[PDB]
Structures are given as structure tokens and as C-alpha cells.
Amino acid sequence: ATLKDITRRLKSIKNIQKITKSMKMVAAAKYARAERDLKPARVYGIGSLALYEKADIKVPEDKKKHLIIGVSSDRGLCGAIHSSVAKQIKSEVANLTAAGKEVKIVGVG
Amino acid sequence: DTPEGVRSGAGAVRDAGGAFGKKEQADEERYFRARAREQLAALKKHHENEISH
Amino acid sequence: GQMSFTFASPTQVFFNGANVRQVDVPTQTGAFGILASHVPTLQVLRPGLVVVHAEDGTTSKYFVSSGSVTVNADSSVQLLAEEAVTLDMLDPGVAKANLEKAQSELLGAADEASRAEIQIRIEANEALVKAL
Amino acid sequence: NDLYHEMIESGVINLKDATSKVALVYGQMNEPPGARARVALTGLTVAEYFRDQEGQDVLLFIDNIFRFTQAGSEVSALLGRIPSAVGYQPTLATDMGTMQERITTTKKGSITSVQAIYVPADDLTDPAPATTFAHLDATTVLSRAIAELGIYPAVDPLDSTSRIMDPNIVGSEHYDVARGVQKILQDYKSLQDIIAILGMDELSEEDKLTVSRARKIQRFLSQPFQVAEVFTGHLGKLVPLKETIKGFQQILAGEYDHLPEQAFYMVGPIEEAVAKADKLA
Amino acid sequence: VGSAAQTRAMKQVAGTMKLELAQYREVAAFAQFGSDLDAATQQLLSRGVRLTELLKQGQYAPMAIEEQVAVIYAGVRGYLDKLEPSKITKFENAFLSHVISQHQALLGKIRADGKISEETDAKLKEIVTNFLAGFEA
């Protein structure tokens, strides 16, 4: 482990630290914007929710087909954001397709 | 700041030759290997077009 | 009569869960005034003007592109609009211009689908120029 | 030469009459390494006069104790002694001990030494920094960032440390005040990222309060100096320890939380701060 | 030694240049992908790149103190923020020629007086603005 090797590794990790910090700043700005309009989006989505909130509707017993809309981004570096959604989709397609319902998945993301 | 402190430079990640450097090397290749295929196919289409005309 | 009214758009949020007397809404299959205890009626919107008769007495007026008038069994009406725009920001001169331009496009719209699209344009423009 | 002239203009050394307060011993670099090595001993003896014969509390200012260490290493190299690790003199510890151990408190008096320290290659583990730190009892870190804020003296409060900062020595009240002002600035620094990211309005009510008090404290740290009075136009203040403790504990308690932050900037005792607040507008 | 070794005019412009450039160094990391940053950060990055383009000097081309003061004055006041980054050096050269030939009196004032008097600053402002308006062709 020459001083050369130690220096190379140290410099590389320093660069990685700087880049990650700047990336954190940019993600913070984007999150600040996304939280801002999440409040207007919230009540609008609640309007859609109200349909089954008041008019309680459930799938009768079984559907011939099924649609699974798993939404996510195309950019990673967000922990398990995509992983969790994929896991839920896999659990559902495992949960479904036993009753015969042909599940289909639209991968937004 | 103080000059004595070790100072990093551009390319250190690749110069290290560690996992992150290898990831950068492979990632660049995977992207442009695909891009070359698209570019080559477009060139083939251009050649076919000029052959037709 | 203590009727919670939620008028919201993807961009901006208007009255939200607010007690209102009447909400005249530009709904398809005819316009019906939202009441305190109107029968639960899930009807889709059409381009036009919505008038919310706030219990205080003043009646705010907004323009609606389209959406769903989700009035529940209880006194809760959810007026979701894709484009909820106030009357001031709309430009009357360009409103008339667009109306006439679409009317001209009607003849050139050979395709019945395309003619239907220009028909949607002229319908929206008609309601628009009435608003302006 | 700059230091000499600046000291003359400040008044610590007077040329007209015997009102001088400092004795200068210069070991300038152009002198051979042995002379630089023994200059510190020369100055220490000159201070030793006042401690023993006059029974006074002297202040020995040794600039760059690192150059003393380096001169010792050079002298050892010239004498031919096999160099130790990193190349410092084999007798580094003993030389440093011989020099420092004379700077102590005797029955007649005491010699306190404010020694400037240079850290080679920014390595605190380097032999010279380590050996010097073994004899240290307090550290004063003059930080450019604190200078940028405008706080003069530009001492970094959190980074500066002392070894007598223990209740048994300083007093329970003193320790409580110093510990409190330490935390009140540490949490302000920690949340300073939070406000920078989310916003000041995105802080809790107490988080807003601690910012105000910490900003008051960081301003209250600044104190006008009498040596720079001629230039700054503001009379220098010599706050007693009791006054410092009282003011800082008052600010911590929130007694002067209504006061504006500017009232605590470049003031002496807390009475001056409140009077200045009155003076404003 | 610091500012004690600088002409009063050079002191006046250089202090502001130093502060702006230091801030740019502070925010330089974001620049790579700092498009989505606060407007203050964008302003810092723009002023930094403009100043950095200003500092660049060709080899074996020593400049006079007055000309340096003129260029730094052009940069720090913010007359070059609108100008495209690559255009900054071209403007530096063209403005140097313009001020040296048309307005040698003002350079003499900076050279002789040794400071940017208020009248000079007003005159310098007029000259820089006028040339900048016509510089782009």
C-alpha cells in the first residue's frame, strides 16, 4: 500500500464526496419544488378518491383481466423507491393470476 | 485553503482503478457501444438511400 | 346549506370544503345548479363558466375546461377541473380570433375525426367568447 | 519590522518614556540555526526575570514554536546525531521539555506562554505538533470564517478548547455558561443547514428562538480592543470574567431576547449592549 | 503584503473581484449540474465564469495597470454578465483597443491620479456601456 495508492484512493473518495454533496443540494431543490405543488395535487387526487370514499365500490368477486400501474421515475439513486414498487407489483402479480385474472403491467418508469 | 492538505484532481476516480473507476469505464462503453450501433444503422440507411438515388 | 364545495385544478386550488349555497356548473348533458342537497350525480363537465354562490352572498365566477362534478350523497361536491381559469386572465381579442380561426378550419377539416376536433375547438371558443 | 512599528503605534511599546509593556527578542531567519534555537530560551529568561525577581505574571509570546523545533532539528543534524522519525532531532521531546517546563507557575509568580503553532503538512500526528500539544493547556483558533462574519476577535468559539474548562477548576457557574454557549452555537450550526435547505419559516418555534439567541451570542463574543481603538474609533473594553458570565447567562436565559442582534455586536458588558439597543434609532 | 502593494484603483476593483471570485469558488461544485439551483447560485456561477475569462492573459503580453483596471472594472460592475462566456475575451481585447486609442485621457487619469475618482467612474461607466452596446456585431 504505497503512499501513491493511498493518495489515489483518498483523492477519488474526496471527489465522490464533493459530487454527492452537490447532488444532494440539487435533489433538495427539486424536492422543495415537488413538495410545493404536492399540496395542490393532494386535494385534486382526493377528489378522485371521493368516488369510492363515499360510493363504496369493490370488485365483485373476480375480473377476467387486471391492470397494475406501477409509477416511478427513470432516474435511480433514490434508495428503494423503485425497488419497493417493483416488490409490490411482484407480490400482487403473485397474489393475482392464481384466480385466473390476466394481470398486465404498465411500467411508468 | 491551506496548500499542505492533499488536493484531488479531475480523473482521480478513474486513476484510482477501484470499483468506482471500473464502473465509470464500463458505463461509458455500454452507452457509446449502443450509440455506435444506432449511428452505424443510420449510416447504413443513408448508404441505402443514396444507392436508391 | 352547509354544503362543502371543493373546486380544485391540477395547478391551483379554489374553494375547498367550503359551505356554499349554490354552484352553477357548466356540466355536460345540460347545466344543473349544485344545491345544498342535490341528488348524488356524477356528471362530466363541458367548457363553460362555473358560478359559486357563496353563503355570504357574493358569487365568484370561474371558467372550467372539463372534469367531473362529484356531488356525493352528503353535502360534498368535488368539482375537479383540468383547467380552472378565472375570467380576467382570458384574453377577449384572441378569444374571438381563435373562435373565427377554428370556424374557418371547420371547412378544411376533411376528416370527420379532425372535423370533430375542430368542433370541440369551436364549442370551447363559443363558451369562451360568451364568457368574455 | 512591521510588528515593531505596529506595537509602537498601538502603545504597548513607548519610545519616548518608560511606558513600554513588551520586550522583543528577535531570532530572524537569516541567523544561523543555533541562534534561532536559543532565541526562545533568551526570551524565556527575560520573562523569568519578572516572574522571580519582580514576582509578576509574565506573558511569553513565542511565534511558530515549530521554527524552534525545526532549528533544534537542524542543530542536531549539524552535530551529526542520527535523525529520528520524520527527520526531527533525536532529542525533540527533551528539548521541548527543557524549554516548556521553565514556563510554569512558581511561588513568586507565573509565566503564561501564548505560543503560535504551525502544523506541518496539516498533520497533527506529526512529531513536532504532537510534542508541542503534550505541553499545551489551551488552544485559540483564529478563524477566517469568523473574521468574515465580522466578529473581532476572530476566535472560533466551538473549536477553541481549554484544559482548565472543568467545573472543579473554573467554577460550576462558569462551566455551565461555557457549556451552554457551546451547545447554543453547535445546534445553531447544525440547523443552519436546515434553514439553508428548507427555510427559516420551515423551522420550529424553538428553532427560531435558538437562532436569535445564538446570533446574539456570536455577536456578543465580539469585543472592541483598546490597541485598535485609535483606528476603529471605539473605546476598547476589558470585561471582567464575572461580567462575561453574567452577560452570557442572561442571553442564554432569554432575558435580552427582545433586544436586537446589532445591540450585542462590538460591545463590552451587557449593560453596554442594552444601552446601545436604547441608542439605536 | 496584500492590498498595501496595490494601486488605489486596483484596490477598488480587485477587492470586489476577489469577493465575487471567492463566492464562485464556493459554489463552483454545483456549476457542473447547477442549472437547477437558486438564482443567487446561478448569478455567482455566471459572475465567476466571466471573471475567470477576464483573468486569462496571453503569454508575453504584459498589460498596464490602467488597462487592467479598465478590464476589471468592466467585469466586476457586471457589464459582461449578459455577454456570452466565449465572447468575454474578445470583448476584453476590443475594449482594450477602444479605450487605449479613443480614450487615452481617462487611462492617463487612472495612471496619474492613481484612483478611480467619482468622475472617472462615471466616465468609465459611460465608455464601457457605450462600447458594450456596439461591441457585438
Strands C33-34 vs C48-54: parallel, antiparallel or unpaired: unpaired
In this structure, what DSSP letter does residue D121 have? G
Alpha-carbon separation of residue D171 from A48, D139, D164, D176 (angstroms): 66, 20, 10, 9
Alpha-carbon separation of residue A71 from A82, A88, C96, D51 (angstroms): 9, 11, 41, 79
C-alpha to C-alpha distance for B13 and B22, rounded to whole angstroms = 9
C-alpha to C-alpha distance for D279 and D260, rounded to whole angstroms = 11
Residue with cell 457509446: B32
Alpha-carbon separation of residue D184 from D150, D191, D252 (angstroms): 19, 11, 8
Burial of A29 (0-12, 13-18, 19+ CB in 10 A): middle
Residue with cell 355536460: C28
- D13-49: b or e for each residue (b if 16 or more CB lie within 10 Å)? beeeeeeeeeeebebeeeeebeebbbbbeebbeebbe
CB of A10 within 8 Å of a chain B CB? The answer is yes
Q: Give Cα E46 distance to the centre of its chain.
A: 13
For residue C40, say if its preceding peptide bond is cis, omega within 30 degrees of 0.
Answer: no
In this structure, what DSSP letter does residue E5 have? G
Q: DSSP string spanning D185-235?
A: HHHHHHHHHHHHHT-STTS-HHHHHHHHHHHHHHHHH----STTHHHH-S-
Length in residues, chain A: 109
Burial of E84 (0-12, 13-18, 19+ CB in 10 A): exposed
Helix, strand, or coil here: D66? helix
CB D164 within 8 A of CB D138: yes
For residue D153, say if its preceding peptide bond is cis, omega within 30 degrees of 0.
Answer: yes
Hey, which residues does C7 pair with through a beta bridge? C79
Burial of D152 (0-12, 13-18, 19+ CB in 10 A): middle
C-alpha to C-alpha distance for E114 and E117, rounded to whole angstroms = 9
Q: Give Cα D214 distance to the centre of its chain.
A: 21
CB E87 within 8 A of CB E75: no
**What does this entry list as its resolution, in Å?**
3.1
Q: Which three cell numbers stand for residue B51?
A: 444507392
Residues of B in contact with D120 (CB under 8 A): 4
Helix, strand, or coil here: C60? strand
Strands C3-8 vs C76-81: parallel, antiparallel or unpaired: parallel
Q: Which three cell numbers stand for residue D251?
A: 442571553
**Please, which residues have CB within 8 angstroms of residue D193's CB and are 6 or more apart in sequence?**
none
C-alpha to C-alpha distance for D29 and D97, rounded to whole angstroms = 23
Hey, which residues does C53 pair with through a beta bridge? C22, C59
Using alpha carbons, select from B10, E41, E23, E43 the residue that is nearest to residue A25.
E41
Q: Which three cell numbers stand for residue A3?
A: 503512499
Residues of A in contact with E37 (CB under 8 A): 25-26, 29
Which among A18, A21, A26 has the least Cβ separation from residue E37?
A: A26
- The C-alpha angle with vertex B43 and arms to B39 and B49, in degrees rounded to 5, equals 145
What single letter denotes the amino acid at residue E98? H
> Least CA distance to B6: which residue of chain D?
D121
Using alpha carbons, select from D95, D85, D122, D115 the residue that is nearest to residue D34.
D95
Method used to solve the structure = cryo-EM
CB E44 within 8 A of CB E23: yes
User: What is Dmax (Cα atoms) for chain E?
Assistant: 47
Contact A40 C11 (CB under 8 A): yes
CB D126 within 8 A of CB D118: no
Q: Which three cell numbers stand for residue D80?
A: 551529526
C-alpha to C-alpha distance for D39 and A54, rounded to whole angstroms = 91
Q: Does D188 carry a binding-site annotation?
A: no
CA dihedral of residues C93, C97, C98, C104 (deg, nearest 10) = 160
Residue A67 is a catalytic residue: no
CB of A20 within 8 Å of a chain B CB? The answer is no
Residues of A in contact with D197 (CB under 8 A): 28, 32
**Please, which residues have CB within 8 angstroms of residue D135's CB and are 6 or more apart in sequence?**
D96, D97, D100
Helix, strand, or coil here: C82? coil
Q: Which three cell numbers stand for residue E69?
A: 483596471
Using alpha carbons, select from A16, C73, E8 the residue that is nearest to residue B18.
A16
User: How close D117 comes to chain B (CA, Å)?
Assistant: 14
Among A78, A94, A99, A106, the one annotated catalytic: A78
Q: Give Cα D11 distance to the centre of its chain.
A: 21
The residue ranges of DSSP E strands in chain D, in sequence order, are 57-62, 110-115, 138-139, 161-162
